[PDB]
Structure 1
Amino acid sequence: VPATRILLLVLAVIIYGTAGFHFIEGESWTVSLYWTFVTIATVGYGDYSPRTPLGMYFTCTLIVLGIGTFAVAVERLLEFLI
């Protein structure tokens, strides 16, 4: 699968996660972007996390849609850097 397509897919995940956290959980755009990376990378510091049932359901969807996409993106980036 072309590297650039994987890039677009991970960008779409990032937009989805950031806007979702911002609107559902009410955190700033910057915090929401940071939380999205931390979540889809599976780092999960827990400095930010959803507090609402909708936010919890949303987070599960982001986990399912985002962790695999991010994993493929990082491995494709590895190839270009290495």
Structure 2
Amino acid sequence: VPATRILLLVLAVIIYGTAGFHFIEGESWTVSLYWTFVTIATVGYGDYSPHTPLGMYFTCTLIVLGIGTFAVAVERLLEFLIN
């Protein structure tokens, strides 16, 4: 799979995660984007997390949609700037 295609998939994940957290959990756009990166990179500081049952379900789908996508994107990025 082309790295740029994976990059586009990661951007879609970011939009989905950001907009979802902002609207379900009510956090600002900036915090929501930050939470999304922290979640799909599997850092998970826990300074922000879902507090509603819907937010919890949404976080689970984000985790499933976002973690593999993100990992492959960083590794393809690695290859690109180094090799």
Q: Specify every segment of 5 or more residues in structure 2 that has no aligned partner in the other structure, as ranges.
A: none
CA RMSD of aligned residues (A): 0.3
Alignment correspondent of 2:36: 36
Alignment correspondent of 2:45: 45
Alignment correspondent of 2:2: 2
Q: Tell me the SS of whatever aligns to 2:27.
A: coil
TM-score (norm 2): 0.98
Q: Among all aligned residue pairs of Structure 1 and Structure 2, give the percentage whose two residues are the same amino acid.
A: 99
Give the Cα separation in 1 of the matches to 2:63 and 2:4: 22
Q: Specify every segment of 5 or more residues in structure 1 that has no aligned partner in the other structure, as ranges.
A: none
Give the Cα separation in 2 of the matches to 1:31 and 1:81: 29
Give the Cα separation in 2 of the matches to 1:37 and 1:74: 12
- Per the TM alignment, residue 56 of structure 1 is displaced from its structure 2 partner at its CA by 0.1
- Per the TM alignment, residue 14 of structure 1 is displaced from its structure 2 partner at its CA by 0.2
Give the Cα separation in 1 of the matches to 2:68 and 2:27: 25
- Per the TM alignment, residue 80 of structure 1 is displaced from its structure 2 partner at its CA by 1.2
- Per the TM alignment, residue 72 of structure 1 is displaced from its structure 2 partner at its CA by 0.4
- Per the TM alignment, residue 29 of structure 1 is displaced from its structure 2 partner at its CA by 0.3
Give the Cα separation in 2 of the matches to 1:62 and 1:3: 21
Give the Cα separation in 2 of the matches to 1:56 and 1:31: 17
Give the Cα separation in 2 of the matches to 1:28 and 1:58: 17
In the alignment of these two chains, the number of paired residues is: 82
Query: What aligned pairs does 1:1-82 form with structure 2 within 5 A after superposition?
Result: 1-82=1-82
- Per the TM alignment, residue 81 of structure 1 is displaced from its structure 2 partner at its CA by 1.4
Give the Cα separation in 2 of the matches to 1:65 and 1:26: 21
